């Protein structure tokens, strides 16, 4: 039993936090950055006049 350290074993040097520390399953679209939807709908209501 060997760990195959011959291949470059660059362990992740952060050791600070787990971003998804829980069992949450992420998606490619789930991690986009926006002001959610409530603010966007408010802006949509404003540009239409109400």
């Amino acid at each position: 039993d060997d760990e195959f350290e011959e291949f470059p074993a660059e362990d992740w040097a952060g050791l600070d936090e787990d971003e998804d520390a829980h069992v949450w399953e992420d998606n490619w679209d789930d991690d986009n950055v926006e002001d959610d939807f409530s603010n966007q709908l408010r802006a949509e209501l404003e540009k239409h006049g109400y």
């Binding site: 829980h22 069992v23 949450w24 998606n27 679209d29 709908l41 408010r42």
Partner: protein
């Protein structure tokens, strides 16, 4: 089971003061009004982050904590030293009073130590059920998802097997693990529509709050199969929507498929979920998943619905719906394409044969990956 429920309230108040900075004036008031009470000094190492390091009650409040904790500690010492009561005796409840003092007054560390001590000491059915409930409640208090999973695993495995008619008193918070997590789609609802509460208004802060969780979970679950015969037929469901008109408003809006009021109410739902510590689907399943179900419901039974008219039938801002459709198609759902040169939504709904055959070839891909992995397992 009443304890740790007002503790849940202060935990939610700390959430409302910490994560959303918009609530920084009223959140301070409710946090202070419930932290000067309830003896929040040991449970104030978390509270010091938002407000000052310590509110100006230090001398009086700490004396109350130390005196109360010492009195219970003296009581515990008397039972465990002067009397040799062991096993099935009153020492079991004496250590429950110790754990209650270390939980309701002291920090969670002492309460957890007291719990784990008597859990390993006595394994009686009633005692084991009560402590599992307390461990779950303190776990959902301090947001230790590891502790919530641990108590849920043992309870669903062996603890709930021994003893019945108490699982009906526990699933409402045993499924809270799925409620706080992303899994609000299938497993949550299937074990959470049960309207058998262990108390009239407790655990999840109310029966009304219990319903709001039911409505949110059901809305994430499904769009419009015979849900009229699943939740709408529910008499207690109709009654509580009479109690909450706004909650009744969007639930009927989704049922009636009237998008003009739905989106405004859906945004209100997302804003309400923002003020709730069960905010895990922050960018996935507040409004995007529900409208994915709604848009799928809308564009199905349609072939080419114009962007301009579907925009006014689903709010305003033709460009806003156009960019929303493009984003969601790129996400994968909303099975359709956009004819930009003519501004048309040409859907592509596969037939019952076509869509299902697509599902089989996908599962064929996954299982070929499985058997190839198993072919790796053999011959080595």
């Amino acid at each position: 089971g009443l304890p740790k429920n007002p503790d849940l309230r202060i935990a939610q108040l700390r959430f409302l003061l910490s994560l959303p900075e918009h609530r920084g004036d009223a959140a301070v008031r409710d946090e202070l009004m419930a932290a000067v009470r309830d003896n929040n000094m040991a449970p104030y190492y978390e509270a010091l982050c938002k407000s000052l390091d310590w509110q100006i009650d230090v001398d009086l409040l700490n004396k109350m904590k130390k005196a109360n904790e010492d009195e219970l500690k003296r009581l515990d010492e008397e039972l465990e030293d002067a009397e040799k009561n062991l096993g099935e005796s009153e020492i079991r409840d004496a250590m429950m009073a110790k754990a209650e003092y270390l939980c309701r007054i002291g920090d969670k560390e002492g309460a957890l130590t007291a719990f784990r001590k008597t859990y390993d000491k006595t394994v009686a059915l009633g005692h084991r059920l009560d402590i599992v409930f307390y461990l779950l409640r303190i776990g959902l208090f301090y947001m230790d998802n590891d502790l919530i999973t641990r108590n849920t695993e043992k309870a669903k495995s062996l603890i709930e097997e021994g003893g019945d008619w108490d699982r009906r008193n526990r699933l409402k918070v045993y499924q809270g693990l799925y409620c706080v997590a992303i899994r609000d789609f299938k497993q949550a609802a299937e074990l959470f529509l049960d309207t058998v509460s262990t108390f009239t208004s407790y655990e999840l802060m109310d029966y009304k709050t219990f319903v709001t969780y039911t409505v949110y979970v059901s809305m994430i679950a499904l769009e419009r199969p015979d849900l009229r015969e699943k939740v709408i037929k529910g008499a207690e469901i109709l009654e509580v929507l009479h109690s909450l008109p706004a909650v009744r408003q969007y639930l009927f809006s989704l049922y009636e498929c009237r998008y003009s009021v739905f989106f405004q109410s859906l945004a209100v739902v997302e804003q309400e979920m923002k003020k709730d510590w069960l905010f895990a689907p922050h960018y996935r399943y507040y409004v995007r998943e529900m409208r994915i179900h709604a848009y799928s419901q809308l564009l199905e039974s349609y072939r080419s619905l114009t962007l301009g008219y579907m925009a006014e039938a689903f709010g305003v801002g033709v460009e806003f719906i156009d960019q929303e459709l493009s984003r969601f198609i790129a996400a994968g759902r909303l099975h359709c394409k956009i004819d930009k040169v003519n501004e048309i939504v040409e859907t592509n709904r596969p037939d019952s044969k076509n869509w299902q055959y697509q599902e089989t070839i996908k599962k064929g891909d996954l299982l070929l990956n499985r058997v190839q992995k198993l072919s790796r397992v053999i011959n080595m």
